[PDB]
């Protein structure tokens, strides 16, 4: 009845020693230094963990007020250990997965009438196994982060609204270890105003059906524990097939931004959260979420940033990245779900480095958008207005090009600081366009009718080529 403690029970995945283990939060937490990473093939997983964890820390250390207490706790290799085992044994029970009263994320009294499979938790791209309860936890989490709103039609819900991080990009810097990772992640934190969903009291349907319950989106780890859906998972006897379901805590707009989303300005000067996209190279948004550009970085990027320089003023240097998790989406529909890896350079926030990347990337915009030209050019030369797009589509120019410089933006963004990095940038450029070009020669070289196309192109991308 009363089972599966979150805080003392395997499910958690983290590798430790070369091998993946399955921990629970309270031996995450004061044994973070123990473990490389987390570690999942989901990055929704992967990224809800770490919030979770985020939002424990925060609340038990009511902090860190100060970056520097960031540091100590990083000299010393451990967090404080008895404020954190205080605030688990005083909320210890509110962390069982199945609970009469209080189930952690869930809605003790859904009924059990005309379930849903657990699958409906996951992500959808584009029978039914019984989950493990570890499985079923983490399935839980992804869901109250990440569900796309849209069609619900229950308990007087007609469709749902979005899931607090459904959409933006996560900044999640990383570490060597899980103790650097969560350090990095801790921004500077004021525990007023704010508080997870297990210290406030367990939701009940009556707050919930025609969505009578409304919070405005808004302290920082209310957000990162958000009950976007209503969710009962019942308990097979040793493992999960079905959930009670229904809404659902109603957003309310408020000025308040996820430490791990950044912004962008659009052109008409509306503030956009950086997004991953279907094709679109995710660097490519890198110079236009800087303040300097309207934009804003995300608090936990500026926070690793500063930690880093803190470290390095210190010969504490030690080795740091930057991942970015979430999923590729349109509307209802999730289209994907990527991890991406960079350098986090340790200079990036400063005016140089700024301008360094500002031109990096507007040279890259500009050659790109020389070559969609000459690729539209080329379609045209070649051949209705059906036709041209599958052909200019199907010319590998654009994608080649882009595809090279993913392979190439990881060497200049690690030296960005540095002035001499424009000219390696200058360099993969042209060997970018130089290798899209001549794939794209080899495509045109094999019908009569391509070889218009082909010699007015190869003119235009001498054009192109001697501008750089």
């Known amino acids: 009845l009363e089972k599966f403690n979150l805080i003392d029970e395997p499910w958690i995945p983290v590798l430790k020693g070369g091998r993946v283990v399955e921990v629970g939060i309270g031996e995450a937490l004061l044994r973070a230094h123990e473990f490389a990473r987390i ?30 207490d960031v540091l100590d706790w990083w000299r010393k290799g451990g967090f404080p250990q008895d404020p954190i085992r205080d605030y688990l044994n005083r909320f210890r029970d509110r962390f069982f997965l199945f609970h009469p009263e209080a189930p952690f994320l869930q809605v003790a009294d859904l009924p059990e009438e005309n379930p849903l499979p657990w699958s409906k938790l996951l992500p959808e791209l584009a029978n039914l196994p019984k989950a493990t309860y570890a499985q079923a936890a983490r399935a839980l989490l992804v869901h109250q982060a990440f569900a796309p709103g849209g069609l619900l039609r229950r308990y007087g819900v007609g469709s749902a609204k979005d899931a ?5 990009a996560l900044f999640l810097p990383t570490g060597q270890n899980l103790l650097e990772t969560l350090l990095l992640n801790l921004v500077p934190y004021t525990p007023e105003d704010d508080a997870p969903i297990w210290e406030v009291p367990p939701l009940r349907l009556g707050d919930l059906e025609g969505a009578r319950t409304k919070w405005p989106l808004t302290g920082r780890t209310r957000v990162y524990t958000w009950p976007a859906r209503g969710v009962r998972l019942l308990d097979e006897g040793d493992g999960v097939r079905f959930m009670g379901y229904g ?21 008409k000067g509306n503030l956009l959260v950086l997004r991953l996209s279907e094709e679109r190279s995710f ?13 804003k970085v995300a608090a936990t990027l500026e926070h690793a940033e500063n930690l880093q320089g803190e470290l390095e003023d210190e010969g504490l240097e030690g080795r740091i990245t930057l991942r970015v998790l979430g999923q590729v989406s349109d509307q209802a529909k999730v289209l994907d779900i990527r991890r991406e890896v960079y350098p986090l350079p340790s200079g990036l926030l400063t005016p140089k480095a700024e301008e360094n990347l500002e031109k990096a ?14 690729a539209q050019e080329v379609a045209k030369a070649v051949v209705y207005l059906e036709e041209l797009t599958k052909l200019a589509n199907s010319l590998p120019l654009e994608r080649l090009y882009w595809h090279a410089l993913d392979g190439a933006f990881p060497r200049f963004f690690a030296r960005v600081e540095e002035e001499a990095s424009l000219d390696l940038w200058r360099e993969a450029l042209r060997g970018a366009a130089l290798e899209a070009w001549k794939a794209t020669r080899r495509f045109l070289g094999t019908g009569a009718r391509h070889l218009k196309a082909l010699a007015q192109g190869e003119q235009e991308f001498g054009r192109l080529l001697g501008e750089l």
Request: aromatic content about 2%; charged content about 25%; proline content about 12%.
């Open 39 to 68: 570690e999942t093939p989901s990055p929704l997983e992967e990224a809800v963990l770490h919030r979770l964890l985020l939002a424990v820390l925060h609340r038990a250390l009511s902090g860190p007020r100060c970056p520097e």
């Open 361 to 374: 990337l507007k040279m890259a915009e500009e050659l790109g958008q020389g070559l969609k030209h000459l």
């Open 247 to 267: 809404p659902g805590v109603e957003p309310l707009e408020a000025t308040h931004r996820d430490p791990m989303v950044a912004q962008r300005l659009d052109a």
């Open 283 to 295: 660097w490519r948004d890198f110079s236009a979420m800087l303040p300097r550009q309207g934009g």
């Open 164 to 168: 607090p991080v459904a959409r933006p």
